[PDB]
Design a binder for this molecule. Sequence first.
Ligand SMILES: Cc1cc2nc3c(=O)[nH]c(=O)nc-3n(C[C@H](O)[C@H](O)[C@H](O)COP(=O)(O)OP(=O)(O)OC[C@H]3O[C@@H](n4cnc5c(N)ncnc54)[C@H](O)[C@@H]3O)c2cc1C
Ligand SMILES: Nc1nc2c(c(=O)[nH]1)N[C@H]1C(S)=C(S)[C@@H](COP(=O)(O)O)O[C@H]1N2
Ligand SMILES: Nc1nc2c(c(=O)[nH]1)N[C@H]1C(S)=C(S)[C@@H](COP(=O)(O)O)O[C@H]1N2
Ligand code: MOS
Ligand code: MOS
Ligand code: FES
Ligand code: FES
Lengths: 1288, 99, 50, 50
Amino acid sequence: ASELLFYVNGRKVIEKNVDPETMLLPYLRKKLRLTGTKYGCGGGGCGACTVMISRYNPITKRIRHHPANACLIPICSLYGAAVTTVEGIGSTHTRIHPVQERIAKCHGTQCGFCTPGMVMSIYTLLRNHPEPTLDQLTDALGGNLCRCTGYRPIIDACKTFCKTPKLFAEEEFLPLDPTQELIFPPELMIMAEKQSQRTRVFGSERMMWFSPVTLKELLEFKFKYPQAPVIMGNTSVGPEVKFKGVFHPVIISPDRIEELSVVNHAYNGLTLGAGLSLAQVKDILADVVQKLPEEKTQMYHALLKHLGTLAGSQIRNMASLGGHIISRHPDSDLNPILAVGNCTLNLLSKEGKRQIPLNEQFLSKCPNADLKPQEILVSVNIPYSRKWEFVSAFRQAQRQENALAIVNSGMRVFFGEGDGIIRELCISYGGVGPATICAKNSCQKLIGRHWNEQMLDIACRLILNEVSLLGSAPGGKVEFKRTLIISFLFKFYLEVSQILKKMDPVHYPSLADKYESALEDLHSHHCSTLKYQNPKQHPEDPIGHPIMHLSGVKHATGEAIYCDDMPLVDQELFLTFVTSSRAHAKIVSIDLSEALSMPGVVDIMTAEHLSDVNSFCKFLATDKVFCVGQLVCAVLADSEVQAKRAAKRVKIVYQDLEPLILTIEESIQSFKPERKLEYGNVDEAFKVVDQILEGEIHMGGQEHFYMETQSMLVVPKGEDQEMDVYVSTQFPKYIQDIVASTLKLPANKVMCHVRRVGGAFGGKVLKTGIIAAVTAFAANKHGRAVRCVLERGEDMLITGGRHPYLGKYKAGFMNDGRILALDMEHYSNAGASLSLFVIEMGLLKMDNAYKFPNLRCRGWACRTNLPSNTAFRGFGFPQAALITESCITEVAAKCGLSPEKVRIINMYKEIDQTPYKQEINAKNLIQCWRECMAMSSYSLRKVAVEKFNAENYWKKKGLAMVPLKFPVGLGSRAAGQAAALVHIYLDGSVLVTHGGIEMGQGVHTKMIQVVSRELRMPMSNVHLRGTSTETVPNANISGGSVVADLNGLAVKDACQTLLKRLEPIISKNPKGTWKDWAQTAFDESINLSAVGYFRGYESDMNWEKGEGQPFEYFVYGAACSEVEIDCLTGDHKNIRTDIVMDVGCSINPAIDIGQIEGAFIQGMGLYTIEELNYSPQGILHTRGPDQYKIPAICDMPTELHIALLPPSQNSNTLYSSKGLGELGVFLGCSVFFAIHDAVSAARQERGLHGPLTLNSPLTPEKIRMACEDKFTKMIPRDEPGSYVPWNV
Amino acid sequence: HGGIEMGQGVHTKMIQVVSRELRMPMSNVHLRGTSTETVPNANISGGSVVADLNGLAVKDACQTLLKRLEPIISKNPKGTWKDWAQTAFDESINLSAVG
Amino acid sequence: NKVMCHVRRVGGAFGGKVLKTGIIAAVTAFAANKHGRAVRCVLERGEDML
Amino acid sequence: EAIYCDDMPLVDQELFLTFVTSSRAHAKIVSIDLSEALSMPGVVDIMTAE
Ligand SMILES: Cc1cc2nc3c(=O)[nH]c(=O)nc-3n(C[C@H](O)[C@H](O)[C@H](O)COP(=O)(O)OP(=O)(O)OC[C@H]3O[C@@H](n4cnc5c(N)ncnc54)[C@H](O)[C@@H]3O)c2cc1C
Ligand SMILES: Nc1nc2c(c(=O)[nH]1)N[C@H]1C(S)=C(S)[C@@H](COP(=O)(O)O)O[C@H]1N2
Ligand SMILES: Nc1nc2c(c(=O)[nH]1)N[C@H]1C(S)=C(S)[C@@H](COP(=O)(O)O)O[C@H]1N2
Ligand code: MOS
Ligand code: MOS
Ligand code: FES
Ligand code: FES
């Protein structure tokens, strides 16, 4: 019966007979047509769907504003509330909000897909704290991810709100007026001011949803429907119905019940309401901690510690305390702490009040200690700590926040007045089994003992077998988890054996001098500076100026249309895929009968239904699958919901096939084509060298993790089989080809149109086209527009990633570290299909900065039963150059020289020759290295790090510096050709287009800068809509770091042609407007339309001889990075990074510096935190701590300096600029080798010499286990083939 | 081109022009419509001369295109338009032309 | 450069789909822009002749 | 199968525009009352020359 009534952006919204399953994000986008709020991930991790929620408290008379992730909010929860999206706070056709203005004008948007989420997080925080500190702002953005910007420019935007040659004018940003903000809708105040007791009911065919608004009613509903979940935040129930096949016919979702949100400050402690958010609990406890003395606030400190890291701001503000406790997630950060602290739960039934203790049995879901099915959690009591009572909580995740714990803990000790005899002890752990578990038996055996090292050795033994994991444990990482268990035990020993020292100095011993640093942990502040140059040029010429991205403000306001933001076209269908669940198996059968009969389903296509158009230059699996994630079926339905429902009812029966090949080593057991480069004579050189060294390095893959998933709309016109394809891709011409081929049509019938892409980084080409081809086949077959958009989980599985690499090397060198001989082997892991291109660029760019006089280099791509890998930002360089740096730091080790001494003496001279016999001027390579050594103060900081490491046993620092020679160029002249089309209308305005695609790199911004210079008119007079095969035909891929270079030359070419035609008119009226010139040109029959064309940079390679001139120019750079590691937990912190870069003359230094930072952080992630976990069966793991993590704000180095070396003329390139964009990625390994250095310093001090090869990614697991100590030796281990592991 | 099809068959005639000038069947040529986005500043479709005038402009683009390709055509006179177009791309010859 | 006009075919015009057409398009586009909505205007025969 | 202008599919949330036309050949416009028209089902806006 009831009606749902809430507000969105100030406007009333009413739904009668609303479906309770409707989530807010699709509702905003589809029913309200507010497409600013974006889908990124659908689990609440990325923050792209961030909105503000406002609520009136009728008793306290206060409006509360909190951020939240719209993907997880069911609209039935919003009754009487006010939502605000990015569109609500301002727009270009009203007034822009300052948050929107500044994030854009500080260049805090690249692709722009993450920008609305960032804006709403910052907006919401400024609504709660009008005059904030940067701490609060960066805390608010803990939940918000970005794959393009590197966060620095978003941090700068935030700083302009904080009362504490640049790229932006801060002194012109309009001030935040806190009184002219959005008014809370008065109707909602009036509704709130009259507490209706009537409980609301919403139904559909599938689900009943009850919102009780009194406590009486809540208990009434909990009795009737005992098995119905009580939804508070939906951050536990929501994510598991989405991708764990769970469904609830009845939901109970209470409104603000006062008894559920109590905050009692008792004499013995405090009792906290079960319906308080985790964010509100963090605030209550922060205040209590400051208002009370610091031995009654022991529990409250451990809770604050873990709440600082728990998820981000949006999830904390949605998630309830009762939800957290009842969920009983094994990785829960708060439950293990509550477990140890004598906490009790206040239960309430229709039958009565009742109280149970929060213990292990409860956390294990033993029904004796559990809630009975008909009752609800009202509140929890957390008592004050007694004097001589101490509490500690630890955790380790993949990154420092917004990441689920691999292992965590809560631990308590009680001494009871004076003497160090332990009278009580509770030790609880998470991530070590199905639930949070307490080591009670170990704890019994330790009662009576003193606090000293005799008891540690035994305590460690007797927990390590009580809280054991089998080698085949879910979650993997067994030996790391084993270590963390006892390493946290050590840290607790230290910590509490110091508060004892503090409180009772004479009776207890002080800690060992090299141990103290183990206690305080690594927790950031974010500083940055930027040098670059900027007389002779006109002030109206925009070339060289840091012009804001043209869509920057549209990103900030959500007015930028990305592919899925396009409005629903009349009667469009949705397409979703059934993907393979086996890595190498026979397809015995497919049953579609159940799926085909379900609501909305129109058609389900297997490979039979594509017949002779199931492959191009195969799309759908025929009779075998060759990796997980391979396409098998295509389900076409009236909606996305119906499509996915029906897809999950398709039954495919398999039969596994041998061999199941997963690694590169397995793949070496017919004929693979070799590539080879040879310089000098390496076989002779291996006889005149002082020493020889063999080794190898594995390198992991990498997900593109563009924030916009794969997305397209295919629309048949209904005439002559014309299709229009709107798709997020980097290569429209290829989309046109594969769709036309699939439909058996000429290319003139199929047109591909692309306005913008929300990031691509190489991973929106081949696989995109397959999906478009299949999608277009369905569209054409049924005469319907068809939309296909992938969810994040499917996307990562179906699309590939970067190629994993194996490097083997034999290096002959001199005792001064110079490398005269080098034999080298590269192996890419290709996945199911071919990849050879990536090997070729690997080998050509392998040299990097160094002159190897004798070199044999050989590479092979290796097919496995994994998703087929694709090209990525860098194109083999980040892999290939890491092989050679690993080889250097090993040679450095064997010479007792720093790697940076070995690098500097193996570098190319000013003039020198590459392994492929191309001449190079490497002057700017030397300068880049000189200036980076000077700027960074490398030599002084080197002794500072050595000094530190001599004084600290459990925490080490490291420093590294790597150089960059990044060559640029494609295989042929034809691959570099580029075209444009320019119109001048009779009002003088200009429309330009070209074959390049805007993916967030600012190519369209740069082309208007070119047009503005060449025609001598303001950029406001030029306009560009998009890219289209209809306007500019035969365009090459938007790739190879040269999109702007090449399309810039073609745009310039059209402009000059146009200016030549007009020069008669211009000379005869030199003071006239473009409107006058255009008009008289028309009046004199002069054409105002012109194609522009650039033929391409000359380029070639004879791969037989290994010699050629493949590259047009070389980008030079260097980068220094400093880190501190925790040897007990494997954590690390990026302290500082320094980057110098030769860019020629930057066409736009804002955009070019944006690309350096973005690439650097992307490389930083590749080499440290980004990790793809596959099972022995080839299944990708995507849940719990197996979650893939891209770099967040907390990973961005505390200090960051970036210099652009002053220019020196490249007549061959566009305005002497050098195409950066992909370069910066390899510079991320400065962090890798800084960590490598830190680990070596721990291994030298402790005396473990010889072979240390650390592989990429350098994860916390790999760091910890490399810092061997008594705890690494102590842990129990397995035989290799005795168990089947969760991973590898 | 800038002409509008009102039922007088102007688009039919332009494909007839293209077919003669590039020496290819009309089945190989296609036209979607008219747009200020593709052809700017076009005059009214009126005065009994829409086909005459836009026909001369279509012919002009075709001839330009044929001049660029004549090297490729003389070197392979029995080749398809697919072959000529492909080798033109491979030799960095532009296949778009204003008339 | 912000406004583009696209025409596939006309079902006869004979001169009578120029000035008056443009006025109606101008008024129509003003409404569309004002309300952020696509707006369709099609005349019935009686109104059209008048 | 030939698409003429009104044959184009309905685009998401499009509105329709229709005109009130003059009923006199040469007259002064003393007044326009839109109050009844504006209150009726579906109506979004009514524009005069103002
Ligand atoms: C992106 C993301 C990141 C996260 N990161 C972390 C992290 O770093 N560390 C960590 O520990 N956790 C993390 N979590 C887990 C999160 O903290 C929990 O999901 C949350 O606390 C559950 O609260 P809720 O209100 O959303 O529970 P809901 O999803 O609303 O409910 C879950 C269960 O609780 C029941 N329930 C709720 N309230 C009551 C009550 N009063 N009485 C009886 N039953 C009740 C429901 O019936 C249901 O069965 C993360 C979650 C997400 C989505
Ligand atoms: N924001 C953003 N920057 C990006 C990309 C992207 O998808 N988004 N792609 C990268 C890749 S793979 C390439 S190959 C280059 C190509 O564009 P450019 O030649 O203009 O640098 O952009 C790089 N920078
Ligand atoms: N079917 C048809 N024929 C038509 C018209 C039309 O609208 N429909 N318009 C006429 C008018 S007014 C003119 S001015 C000419 C212009 O086109 P042409 O120059 O190609 O003859 O077409 C004439 N023939
Ligand atoms: O150069 Mo990477 O976009 S193919
Ligand atoms: O020539 Mo009549 O179409 S103006
Ligand atoms: S934040 Fe909801 S989409 Fe990831
Ligand atoms: S701009 Fe943040 S994701 Fe590309």
